[PDB]
């Protein structure tokens with residue numbers, strides 16, 4: 564039936580700034596929070612302020628040298644770290660900004676705290692819209708991500724769960740999470756993403772894991788313009804087959820909103836309803852679930868998406884007319900929650916979708 568939802572948020576998160584011209588805007592987390600507060604969704608969930616994750620918590624995955632660098636570098640001392648900046652990929656995509664380490668601590672704190680709550684069986688769902696930074700690697704920042712909160716949260720879940728399923732619906736391949744667990748069967752990673760002349764360049768259909776992890780990495784490569792109809796007809800059948808064969812005891816879902824129509828960096832054509840249908844599909848399996856954020860660069864649509872997905876988690880119907888809120892003017896000219904798809908061509912033909920789904924089903928038949 565209806566589930567208990569715990570939500571993690573720190574009011575300072577919206578003040579972190581990646582810099583002029585950088586598309587990653589932490590302010591979108593504050594817009595999401597304010598919109599869900601104005602819809603009255605706070606009366607239905609337990610709201611928690613995550614602790615600032617320690618460097619020691621982060622080193623459960625990341626190297627000590629990389630975390631020490633993140634905790635030390637500042638815009639005023641960057642000139643003394645030119646060597647380490649190259650080594651750790653700190654630059655254009657992952658710039659040094661004021662409070663960078665504290666931003667990593669809050670993003671990570673929400674994911675790990677949510678995983679602990681799920682482990683203690685004190686909640687059915689835990690939500691951290693500030694997390695989902697799937698590109699960060701053991702000793703390298705990548706794609707606007709510095710600390711991989713998802714990997715840290717999964718390591719926490721693995722303390723009480725034999726098998727953990729990770730699903731990633733961001734438009735970009737979830738490479739950091741896939742790499743972290745590539746040789747183990749204790750985590751199955753499933754990523755649906757744009758593939759072909761697109762960042763990060765990984766996530767081919769043929770990347771299926773290695774060693775004990777062979778068949779435990781799943782990648783569904785897509786072309787521009789995927790719509791609600793096309794995405795919906797492959798998502799439920801794939802997730803149902805993965806649940807059947809893998810039988811996970813906990814799930815982590817990365818809800819990157821850059822797969823929505825009109826995203827500044829994305830080229831997909833999903834509506835908020837089409838994106839949220841993924842949450843409905845996963846939630847239906849009644850397993851402990853950690854829901855995380857990720858990309859999303861047309862910030863009014865990110866706030867709509869994550870507000871609607873929080874309502875989906877709560878089994879709460881909310882009106883299409885937006886309530887008045889601190890950022891009301893950002894939602895013009897319509898001031899509605901739901902969005903319309905564009906007229907862009909869907910390059911994912913029905914035959915291509917079925918063919919890729921059948922290739923993934925062949926790989927899923929290889930599980931024990």
Ligand SMILES: CN1CC(C(=O)N[C@@H](CCCCCC(O)(O)c2ccon2)c2nc(-c3ccccc3F)c[nH]2)C1
Pocket residue numbers: 584585586655656695696697698706707708733735762819821828856857858859
């Ligand atoms: C060396 N060249 C730059 C590399 C590249 O194409 N980078 C992507 C990175 C896109 C990252 C997407 C992140 C994500 O949405 O998956 C995400 C965000 C949080 O968690 N996951 C990118 N950077 C930008 C960008 C960076 C700084 C300033 C302006 C920009 F447009 C746009 N797209 C190649």
Ligand SMILES: [Ca+2]
Pocket residue numbers: 731732733734735736737754755756
């Ligand atoms: Ca993905």
Ligand SMILES: [Ca+2]
Pocket residue numbers: 744745746747748750751752772776779780
């Ligand atoms: Ca794996």
Ligand SMILES: [Zn+2]
Pocket residue numbers: 733734735819821857858859
């Ligand atoms: Zn993305």
